[PDB]
Ligand binder design. Sequence first.
Ligand code: MG
Ligand code: ZN
Lengths: 108, 45, 243, 166, 152, 148, 289, 297
Amino acid sequence: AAPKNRRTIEVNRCRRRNPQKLIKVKNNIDVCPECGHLKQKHVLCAYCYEKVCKETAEIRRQIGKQEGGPFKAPTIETVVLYTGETPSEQDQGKRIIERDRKRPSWFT
Amino acid sequence: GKSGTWWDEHLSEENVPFIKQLVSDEDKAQLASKLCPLKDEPWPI
Amino acid sequence: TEKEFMQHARKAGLVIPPEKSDRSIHLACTAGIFDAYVPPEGDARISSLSKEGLIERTERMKKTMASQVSIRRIKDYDANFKIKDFPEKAKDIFIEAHLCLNNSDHDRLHTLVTEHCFPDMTWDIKYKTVRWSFVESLEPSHVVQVRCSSMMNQGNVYGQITVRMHTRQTLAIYDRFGRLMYGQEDVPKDVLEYVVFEKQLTNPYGSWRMHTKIVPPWAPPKQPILKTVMIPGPQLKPEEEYE
Amino acid sequence: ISRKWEKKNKIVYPPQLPGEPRRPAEIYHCRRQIKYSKDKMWYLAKLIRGMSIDQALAQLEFNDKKGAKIIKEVLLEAQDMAVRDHNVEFRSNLYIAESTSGRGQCLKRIRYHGRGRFGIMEKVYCHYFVKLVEGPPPPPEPPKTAVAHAKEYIQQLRSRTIVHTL
Amino acid sequence: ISHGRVFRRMGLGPESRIHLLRNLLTGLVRHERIEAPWARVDEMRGYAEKLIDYGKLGDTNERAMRMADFWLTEKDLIPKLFQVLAPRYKDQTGGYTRMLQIPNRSLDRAKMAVIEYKGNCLPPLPLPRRDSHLTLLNQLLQGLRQDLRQSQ
Amino acid sequence: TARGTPSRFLASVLHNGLGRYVQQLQRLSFSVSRDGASSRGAREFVEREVIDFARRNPGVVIYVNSRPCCVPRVVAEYLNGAVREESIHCKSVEEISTLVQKLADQSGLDVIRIRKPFHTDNPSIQGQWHPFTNKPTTFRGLRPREVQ
Amino acid sequence: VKKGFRAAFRFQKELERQRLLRCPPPPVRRSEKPNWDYHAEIQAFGHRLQENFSLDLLKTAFVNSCYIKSEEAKRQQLGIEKEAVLLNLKSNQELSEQGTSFSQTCLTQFLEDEYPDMPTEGIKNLVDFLTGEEVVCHVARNLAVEQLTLSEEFPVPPAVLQQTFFAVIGALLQSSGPERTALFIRDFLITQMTGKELFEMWKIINPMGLLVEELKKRNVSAPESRLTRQSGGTTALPLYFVGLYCDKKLIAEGPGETVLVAEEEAARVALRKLYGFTENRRPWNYSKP
Amino acid sequence: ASQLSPTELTEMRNDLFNKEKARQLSLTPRTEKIEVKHVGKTDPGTVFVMNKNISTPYSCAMHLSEWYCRKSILALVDGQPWDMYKPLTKSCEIKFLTFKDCDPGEVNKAYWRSCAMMMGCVIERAFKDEYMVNLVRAPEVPVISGAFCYDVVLDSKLDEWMPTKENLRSFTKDAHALIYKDLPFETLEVEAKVALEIFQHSKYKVDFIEEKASQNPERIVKLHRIGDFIDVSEGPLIPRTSICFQYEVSAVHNLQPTQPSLIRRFQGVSLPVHLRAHFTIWDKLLERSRKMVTEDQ
Ligand SMILES: [Mg+2]
Ligand SMILES: [Zn+2]
């Protein structure tokens, strides 16, 4: 195929400036009760997500430092702790993984 | 501007089943009320 | 099909005069002040002519003797110089400097003041307009301390003269758009300041230029801002805030 | 190379009179040499246009493009320079008045086709212009109803007179 | 035409798709948290439900043992799955593996999601909590409910 | 063409033909060079006929700046405020005389399109025509297809 | 490079023209320009009107009190004493008042001898419109006397322009005879009423009230409205013709889109016909007796 | 207390209120800087430098973002309820609230009081000028109640009629028209003396002002203004009036065995724009609010 002429700037404007190709304005942006870093409906907040991801990464680092080599997988449940906090009576058969910081207010 | 909204947005955890049961009973009663149309005011046959 | 971008420069002034060279820099001032003058605590209460002398007048006599020997030194180095008409000279120099700063004058303000207080009076005002004006002077100005240094770095000495001043000024700082921001219009407010003048003695000419101004710690607060200032806290990174 | 957009923030105005309005502020800011396409930057500018700064930041934070974060940082630094230097107290009382895109300096490379021929690879570059004005954002132009069209038609039929004689 | 047909294709065929799903299932059994596209995590949850069901059905069964040995390429995860995740859900049926949606990725901007089992020693994800039972609409609904209860 | 240049109407500046006729031209600033071969016509004009041109109409003031230039020009201002500046570069005495006479005879209106050379202020005398003209009125103005 | 200078000069002139066209500078008065002469302009203005003015009266009328105040303020703020010409300027107030009174009485006399059927309010509004600010400002701008008026403000407010116009009118009255100034103000004011509608210069509110008052003053009963012709009563573009009948006799007729505007137009036509100021009246005789 | 047209009374009321506001804003000399702190939860450790008796909490929220201005109804100042349009005095701490919070009680009370005041304002201008009307008070009903009430005394000639659905529809249309225009709830801590001196007409308003000023030794009431109407209410209110998205009045109930004359008690339900529901819940709340409800004891 080969054009016989040349498209004009008017046709280009009518083709690229149509409301179909323009980005639509979404109305799903709100605020978050906690922290508040501009979230969206049906979507988790990035701030708390990053916080829990960092916490899970630290817990996995501590587990790997306690386990040592690969190919382990204990046959008992696990429970994480923080500064102080003596182990309860119903947490005897569970693996204790203590950290080195205070307990956050969003983890009970 | 005005954002999107539905019916189960601003409801608590103990109000959605209540509203569901209420509207279900309401539509069931409305369907049962229109069971005998001849005894009301029927048009001449 | 083999071309790149040029123009590789930096926006930072590093050191390059004294790196393997035989030409130094002939300055005309210094860094800060030689000795900080300490005004009396009861200056506002005893703002009249004179009062009763305090106990142990040895320190004031020693300061007077130091001022006298500094005056003797600056007279032996350069004769023909008065002291009584020096406060009036400092007053008119300050007045003409404020006037040329109000009229947006630089080629004259550079020689009226020193190389130290010029940025402090031209930085946060370059994009703003001022309506400063002198109305009337109250208490006459007097000299409180006369000192001089003897730095033998490049053979240049200076003579800072701390001369107090108390008068009434009219400040009116607008904005770059034409709206008011800081001071009001014609308001004859009362405020005092301690201004020191420094002159390069070793210079073959030498002009009495305003060095800087020292503010006492017990000075009353300035007038508030006409707008609202917001002071946000630190950026809360994904961790925890303990404060 | 010409640079006249970053210098509009130095236009000093004379002091106004007490019998004059407030006059909104004008903040100009733009970046140079941005690895992006001008069409996508213009699409983002058309998405922004005349809206609030907070709404623009919210729309750009969830915009899955490359220049979205760039425009977000541009708006952030412009608001910062406005509240620090342009004498702006309110952070949410701003709106974008003008927002367009330009074209940057381009280079030339090769493409390597499937024979001895080739193409001219022109490194496309662009910029981004934006202006911040204080005060509340102006409301959009409402569509004219049938009353406006009727009045205009009546005015057009009343304005016509005799023609081609006297 | 794909009416009433799921089985979202991912790899170069059914074998590659099953291998990727098995790898995702092994990673979910090990780390208990994996971020991946919505279709991948959906299929992973759909397979993990039946995996938990088969692990709960019994341990001495050869069918469940072979299925656990096939769907787990790390071996050590089989005793864990049979002695931790099986006695945990002894009171639940098929109510587990909660799915939550995340925004996008900082690489190709793709829709992803994160799923995890119940309980979980790891800190829980920020769940989209509903409004409290003290707002105006909730208080009006509670008042209407109390009124219709006292009137009945 | 007419679709590329603006147009106006044909009208008087302040009704000169009704009351009394006044001179529209006011000042004539001439710029004749001292030495050169491009202002000989203007020099001869100022030498021989500028006195007669000034004495012909007392309502026109003639200014001779005599500035050493290269292109002789003339500024003509009218009552309405229009300023038409033309150049008399290399022209004879008769040409300059005809030009200044045409400038003095005209007014300050534009030399664009005339648009309708005839203009009247009271076009309707015996009543302007309307669609109801030449139509007789029926009894009581009864419209057709009625009963009363 | 391209050798040349004439083409470069023409291009620079074109650039300067584009610069002055895009950024229009504030216009300056004709007095501050080099090619300007006050006495020559005064003589030209005196000779172009086919009259016989005087230099002293024109120099006294072409000034203002604001100009004298500005001059004395400028001479006092600097220090130069000029009391040998400033104290003999003589403001143009009494001459302006005399010219205003003469113009008013001449216009009233003309409207009385030409339109005998004009009431007091009608002739009052006519002489107020003829002496209005807009008409005198337009006449002064077309006569090129604003550049000769010595006063502050370049655009010149309408008050000062009307004042100096009345002042030069009074000067012409004091110089020449009354008939010359009468013919002058006639030819320079009444020529503006050509083609203009009567009520456009009067601007009444209730034409029916004044119409019935004039009819009661003419021993007439009371007018009543009747629908003559009509076209389209249910469409968006209606047309009606209301005819005023007095004692079973038509007097006028007025069209309109509705019935109210049609009756108003009919009343206006009847009132203009009763006053004798119609479109078929005798035109003003611009001749000499 | 004398014969006054139904225009000059509100004229003198609003001009006296404007004079009082001018005196309050001119009582302070210059602009005193205050240090108000933000002890919320979203952005902790934020201190603002505002003015004294000039700055408003809405202007303080404008320094943050547009969300803090779109989702804000009542402010918490040292544990006391504070609206968004009220100048501050001393330096302390501020906290913003919203409808979708943990314990939304003060915001709900303020919204109910604002809706009652708006209903009173829209009903005090929908009667005949020949029939005198009086406004008793606005009793604080709990959120569990069906609809808020507002006692209005009519004329003695109208003690036997019942408003049909047309009057209710007209009242709802007038309420929607009043909500369409943006009119803030301008309040001011007016002294009780001048507060009772401005009225001096309806005895019910004077008695209400006396009862609300007899509880505090400072003798300071809380007056509000909606464009050109002055009413006496308790506590703060809502900032803007465009928050109410759905407004509809139920019916009316008349109590007789309590006072010789006949008094009217109108009810109504309202829902904000942030907590809008569907049509089913709307008609349910409309039908449930038509019942008689009282919580005066
Ligand atoms: Mg694929
Ligand atoms: Zn969050």
